[PDB]
Design an enzyme around this catalytic site. Sequence first.
Site, PDB file in Angstrom:
ATOM      1  N   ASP A  14      60.134  32.297  24.915  1.00 29.08           N
ATOM      2  CA  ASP A  14      59.458  33.555  24.946  1.00 29.08           C
ATOM      3  C   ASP A  14      60.892  34.027  26.191  1.00 29.08           C
ATOM      4  OD1 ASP A  14      57.673  33.932  23.635  1.00 29.08           O
ATOM      5  OD2 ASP A  14      56.473  33.909  25.818  1.00 29.08           O
ATOM      6  N   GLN A 285      43.478  48.340  38.683  1.00 28.38           N
ATOM      7  CA  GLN A 285      44.407  47.747  37.591  1.00 28.38           C
ATOM      8  C   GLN A 285      46.530  47.578  38.520  1.00 28.38           C
ATOM      9  OE1 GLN A 285      44.117  47.541  34.566  1.00 28.38           O
ATOM     10  NE2 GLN A 285      42.095  47.038  34.662  1.00 28.38           N
ATOM     11  N   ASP A 296      45.740  35.727  23.937  1.00 29.07           N
ATOM     12  CA  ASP A 296      46.440  34.503  23.818  1.00 29.07           C
ATOM     13  C   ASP A 296      45.604  33.745  24.593  1.00 29.07           C
ATOM     14  OD1 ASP A 296      47.835  34.136  21.907  1.00 29.07           O
ATOM     15  OD2 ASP A 296      49.567  34.344  23.006  1.00 29.07           O
TER      16      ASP A 296
HETATM   17  N1  LIG Z   1      55.409  35.559  14.766  1.00 26.81           N
HETATM   18  C1  LIG Z   1      54.507  34.517  15.951  1.00 26.81           C
HETATM   19  N2  LIG Z   1      54.225  33.774  15.820  1.00 26.81           N
HETATM   20  C2  LIG Z   1      53.762  33.317  17.347  1.00 26.81           C
HETATM   21  N3  LIG Z   1      53.716  33.389  18.452  1.00 26.81           N
HETATM   22  C3  LIG Z   1      54.076  34.613  18.204  1.00 26.81           C
HETATM   23  C4  LIG Z   1      54.596  35.126  16.913  1.00 26.81           C
HETATM   24  N4  LIG Z   1      54.693  36.725  17.179  1.00 26.81           N
HETATM   25  C5  LIG Z   1      54.984  37.268  19.144  1.00 26.81           C
HETATM   26  N5  LIG Z   1      54.095  35.506  19.727  1.00 26.81           N
HETATM   27  C6  LIG Z   1      53.859  34.970  20.158  1.00 26.81           C
HETATM   28  O1  LIG Z   1      52.745  36.302  21.254  1.00 26.81           O
HETATM   29  C7  LIG Z   1      52.087  35.389  22.621  1.00 26.81           C
HETATM   30  C8  LIG Z   1      51.789  36.699  23.566  1.00 26.81           C
HETATM   31  O2  LIG Z   1      51.194  36.852  23.307  1.00 26.81           O
HETATM   32  P1  LIG Z   1      49.616  37.741  23.838  1.00 26.81           P
HETATM   33  O3  LIG Z   1      49.237  36.604  24.746  1.00 26.81           O
HETATM   34  O4  LIG Z   1      48.204  37.558  22.959  1.00 26.81           O
HETATM   35  O5  LIG Z   1      49.707  38.883  24.180  1.00 26.81           O
HETATM   36  P2  LIG Z   1      49.781  40.020  23.209  1.00 26.81           P
HETATM   37  O6  LIG Z   1      50.337  40.064  21.420  1.00 26.81           O
HETATM   38  O7  LIG Z   1      50.976  40.870  23.838  1.00 26.81           O
HETATM   39  O8  LIG Z   1      48.016  40.297  23.716  1.00 26.81           O
HETATM   40  P3  LIG Z   1      47.966  42.383  24.241  1.00 26.81           P
HETATM   41  O9  LIG Z   1      48.237  42.119  25.975  1.00 26.81           O
HETATM   42  O10 LIG Z   1      47.734  42.972  23.217  1.00 26.81           O
HETATM   43  O11 LIG Z   1      46.202  41.349  24.120  1.00 26.81           O
HETATM   44  P4  LIG Z   1      44.662  41.786  23.402  1.00 26.81           P
HETATM   45  O12 LIG Z   1      45.172  43.491  22.562  1.00 26.81           O
HETATM   46  O13 LIG Z   1      45.178  41.030  21.677  1.00 26.81           O
HETATM   47  O14 LIG Z   1      43.802  41.439  24.223  1.00 26.81           O
HETATM   48  P5  LIG Z   1      42.958  42.739  25.001  1.00 26.81           P
HETATM   49  O15 LIG Z   1      43.851  44.024  25.593  1.00 26.81           O
HETATM   50  O16 LIG Z   1      42.060  43.769  24.190  1.00 26.81           O
HETATM   51  O17 LIG Z   1      42.530  42.690  26.443  1.00 26.81           O
HETATM   52  C9  LIG Z   1      41.403  40.577  26.417  1.00 26.81           C
HETATM   53  C10 LIG Z   1      40.735  40.469  27.594  1.00 26.81           C
HETATM   54  O18 LIG Z   1      41.908  40.423  28.401  1.00 26.81           O
HETATM   55  C11 LIG Z   1      41.131  41.220  28.894  1.00 26.81           C
HETATM   56  N6  LIG Z   1      41.671  42.714  29.682  1.00 26.81           N
HETATM   57  C12 LIG Z   1      43.088  42.634  29.320  1.00 26.81           C
HETATM   58  N7  LIG Z   1      43.687  44.110  30.050  1.00 26.81           N
HETATM   59  C13 LIG Z   1      42.616  44.903  30.708  1.00 26.81           C
HETATM   60  C14 LIG Z   1      42.528  45.395  31.949  1.00 26.81           C
HETATM   61  N8  LIG Z   1      43.600  46.036  31.673  1.00 26.81           N
HETATM   62  N9  LIG Z   1      42.187  45.093  32.825  1.00 26.81           N
HETATM   63  C15 LIG Z   1      40.980  43.791  33.081  1.00 26.81           C
HETATM   64  N10 LIG Z   1      41.017  43.350  31.803  1.00 26.81           N
HETATM   65  C16 LIG Z   1      41.636  43.334  30.418  1.00 26.81           C
HETATM   66  C17 LIG Z   1      39.507  41.638  28.853  1.00 26.81           C
HETATM   67  O19 LIG Z   1      38.883  40.457  29.606  1.00 26.81           O
HETATM   68  C18 LIG Z   1      39.947  41.886  27.382  1.00 26.81           C
HETATM   69  O20 LIG Z   1      38.295  41.864  27.061  1.00 26.81           O
HETATM   70  C19 LIG Z   1      54.252  35.370  23.465  1.00 26.81           C
HETATM   71  O21 LIG Z   1      54.200  34.104  23.995  1.00 26.81           O
HETATM   72  C20 LIG Z   1      54.617  35.067  21.636  1.00 26.81           C
HETATM   73  O22 LIG Z   1      55.406  33.727  21.714  1.00 26.81           O
HETATM   74 NA    NA Z   2      47.860  37.657  21.156  1.00 22.98          NA
END
Ligand SMILES: Nc1ncnc2c1ncn2[C@@H]1O[C@H](COP(=O)(O)OP(=O)(O)OP(=O)(O)OP(=O)(O)OP(=O)(O)OC[C@H]2O[C@@H](n3cnc4c(N)ncnc43)[C@H](O)[C@@H]2O)[C@@H](O)[C@H]1O
Ligand code: NA
Length: 338
Positions: A14, A285, A296
Site C-alpha cells: 500500500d 470518534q 479486513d
Molecule cells: N484488488 C484488490 N485486491 C486485494 N486487495 C486489495 C484490492 N484493492 C484494495 N485492496 C486492499 O484493501 C485494503 C484496505 O481494506 P480494508 O482495511 O478493509 O479497508 P476498506 O476496504 O477501506 O474498509 P472500510 O474501512 O470502508 O470498512 P468496511 O466498510 O468494510 O467495514 P465497516 O465500516 O462496516 O466497519 C467494520 C467494523 O469496524 C468497526 N467500525 C468501523 N468504523 C467504526 C467507527 N467509526 N466507530 C466504531 N467502530 C467502527 C465496527 O465494529 C464495524 O462492525 C488495502 O490494504 C488494499 O491493499
Molecule cells: Na475491505
Amino acid sequence: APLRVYVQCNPLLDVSAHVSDEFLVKYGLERGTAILLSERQKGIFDDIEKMPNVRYVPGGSGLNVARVAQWMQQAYKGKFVTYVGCIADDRYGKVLKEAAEHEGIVMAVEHTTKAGSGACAVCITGKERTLVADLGAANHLSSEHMRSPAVVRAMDESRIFYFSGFTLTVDVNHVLQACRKAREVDGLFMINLSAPFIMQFFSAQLGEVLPYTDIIVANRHEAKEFANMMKWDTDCVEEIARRAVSEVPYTGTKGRVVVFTRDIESTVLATKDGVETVPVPQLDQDKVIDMNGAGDAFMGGFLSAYAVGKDLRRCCETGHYTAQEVIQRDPEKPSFSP
Ligand SMILES: Nc1ncnc2c1ncn2[C@@H]1O[C@H](COP(=O)(O)OP(=O)(O)OP(=O)(O)OP(=O)(O)OP(=O)(O)OC[C@H]2O[C@@H](n3cnc4c(N)ncnc43)[C@H](O)[C@@H]2O)[C@@H](O)[C@H]1O
Ligand code: NA
C-alpha cells in the site's frame, strides 16, 4: 488450538498519502471507492510518490485479514494461517513476505518474473480512503502454483478457507479449487464481497463460487450492491441477509451464514435460524484515525474466533474488537480473546 486457516488474495504494497479533492478529479476517482488501475489512472503512482509524507506498508485485503487473525493467535505462529498469492522477488515482494512471515504466517506464495509485485494507491481525503489497485504479479497467480506441493499440502491441512472477493478478478478456477477442497476436508469456505465492482463486473465469477460458499461477509454498501445484482427490490440490510441465506444457491452442509457490517451501527448476522443484530461497542470518534480501514480487521478477528469454535455472535464481537483496534492506529498483544 485453532483450526488451520487458508487465505488467498492479492498481496499488494500500500502506497498511502493524503491527497486533495482535485487529485481525485484528476484521476477520475470516486471518493471512498476501490477500483483496479486502468488507463484512466495513467501516472497516479508517480504522482502520489512525488508527495510529502507518503507511506509504504504491506497491504492486500486477504494479507491484512491473515495478519489480524494471526495477531489474535500469537501462541500459534507458524501453525495457524497459510496465505497464498503471487509476488515478484523484488523489493515490495520481499517486504510483503517478510512482514507476514515475521508475524508467523506461512507464505505459500508464487514468484513470477512477469510483472513486479502489486501495489495499491491509498488516497486519503479526510475520513475517506479511495483505493486504486495495480495487481502486477498478483494477477499472474498460476494453476501450476495452485497444484504445487506446498499449496496442496496447505489446503489438505486447513479447515477454514477464506478468499477475498478480489480473487475473482484473477482466475475463478483457483477459487473453485479451494471450494472443492473445503468439501473434501469437511471444512468451511468463506468469501468477502470486497467491493461493489465485484458485483457489477465479476458477477459471473461470483455466481460460480456462491453455491460452494458457507459464509458470506460484506459491508452495508456491498450488501446493497449484492441486492442490486440479484434484482432484489430492497435496501434493508436485514432483508438482504435473510435472502442471501435462503435464496442464493447453496450446496453445502455446514449451513449458510451471512454477516454484513454497518460501521457504527449493528452488524447483521443471518442463518437459516433467523436474523440477529450484534451491537458495535461505543467508541469516541476522535479516536478513529484516517489511516486504516476496518473491513479486513473485522474479518481477521472473526476468523480468529471462528477457528477456536466460538459461536457466530462471538465471532462478530471479536471482529468488532479487532476492527476497533485497527482503526485507532495512527500494539504488541491483544487485550481481548474470543
Ligand atoms: N484488488 C484488490 N485486491 C486485494 N486487495 C486489495 C484490492 N484493492 C484494495 N485492496 C486492499 O484493501 C485494503 C484496505 O481494506 P480494508 O482495511 O478493509 O479497508 P476498506 O476496504 O477501506 O474498509 P472500510 O474501512 O470502508 O470498512 P468496511 O466498510 O468494510 O467495514 P465497516 O465500516 O462496516 O466497519 C467494520 C467494523 O469496524 C468497526 N467500525 C468501523 N468504523 C467504526 C467507527 N467509526 N466507530 C466504531 N467502530 C467502527 C465496527 O465494529 C464495524 O462492525 C488495502 O490494504 C488494499 O491493499
Ligand atoms: Na475491505
